[PDB]
Design a protein around this ligand. Structure first.
Ligand SMILES: COc1ccc2c(CP(=O)(O)O)cc(=O)oc2c1
Ligand SMILES: [Zn+2]
Ligand SMILES: [Zn+2]
Length: 229
């Protein structure tokens, strides 16, 4: 199931969807896995999140070349932390168009990240304004409210049972909400529930630091964010 490709791991989740996993030593936490997605949409590939580093992200592109062999049309990154945007330069070096929440691009320099080339904006109900996410194919981008960070966004894959919560969602057996340094403790619980409501059909919940889980990950995450209130 898990394909090891250099220092990264790739796992097929659906006929056109794979999870990419990369690792970074956090002095004091061990080697932390971070997950993103790779989606084939016809004759092109779409990426959700970089790896932690440029070198790892270039390796994602190398895996895509070997295992899919179609151009990567775009990447969308789900907030301005290293696990999700650390490899932006590698995407730009490869000529890939990049997208992030406008707020993520605003925060990127102070977070030590390189901004994406394009900014997503969101309607009052949280759905991306479609003019800012052109040619996204099956990717349905939703801002659930501030939680893990103020800029965190989420992505469902139309035609599959998969929704990606990024660092907002933890697995159903998780014991903590992880890094709350940039979190909105007041609104976290509501934002987690809004993600679940935006993607009611999704039975496979993919997230940044755990293997894919059932919808119990959403309910469990929300119950824990209640304790920050
Ligand atoms: C589990 O230990 C971690 C994992 C990730 C982080 C990150 C990246 P994120 O997961 O918050 O996006 C930022 C940080 O300051 O410490 C961390 C500690
Ligand atoms: Zn984060
Ligand atoms: Zn994280």
């Amino acid at each position: 199931g898990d394909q090891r490709f250099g220092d990264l791991v790739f796992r097929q989740l659906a006929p056109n969807v794979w999870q990419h996993t990369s690792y970074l030593d956090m002095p004091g936490f061990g080697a932390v896995a971070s997950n993103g997605l790779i989606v084939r949409d016809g004759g092109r590939v779409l990426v959700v999140d970089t790896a932690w580093t440029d070198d790892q992200t270039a390796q994602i592109l190398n895996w895509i070349k070997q295992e899919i062999n179609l151009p990567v049309a775009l990447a969308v990154v789900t907030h301005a932390h290293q696990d999700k945007m650390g490899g932006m330069d590698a995407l730009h070096a490869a000529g890939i168009a990049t997208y992030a929440n406008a707020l993520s691009n605003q925060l990127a320099p102070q977070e030590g990240m390189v901004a994406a080339q394009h900014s997503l904006t969101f309607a009052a109900n949280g759905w991306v304004e479609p003019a800012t996410a052109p040619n996204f194919g099956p990717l349905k981008v939703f801002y659930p409210g501030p939680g893990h960070t103020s800029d965190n966004i989420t992505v469902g894959i139309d035609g599959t049972d998969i929704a990606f919560g990024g660092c907002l969602i933890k697995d159903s057996k998780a014991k903590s909400l992880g890094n709350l340094g940039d979190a909105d403790t007041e609104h976290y619980a509501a934002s987690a529930r809004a993600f679940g409501a935006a993607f009611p059909k999704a039975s496979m919940i993919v997230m940044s630091h755990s293997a894919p889980d059932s919808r119990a990950a959403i309910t469990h995450t929300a119950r824990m964010a209640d304790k920050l209130r």
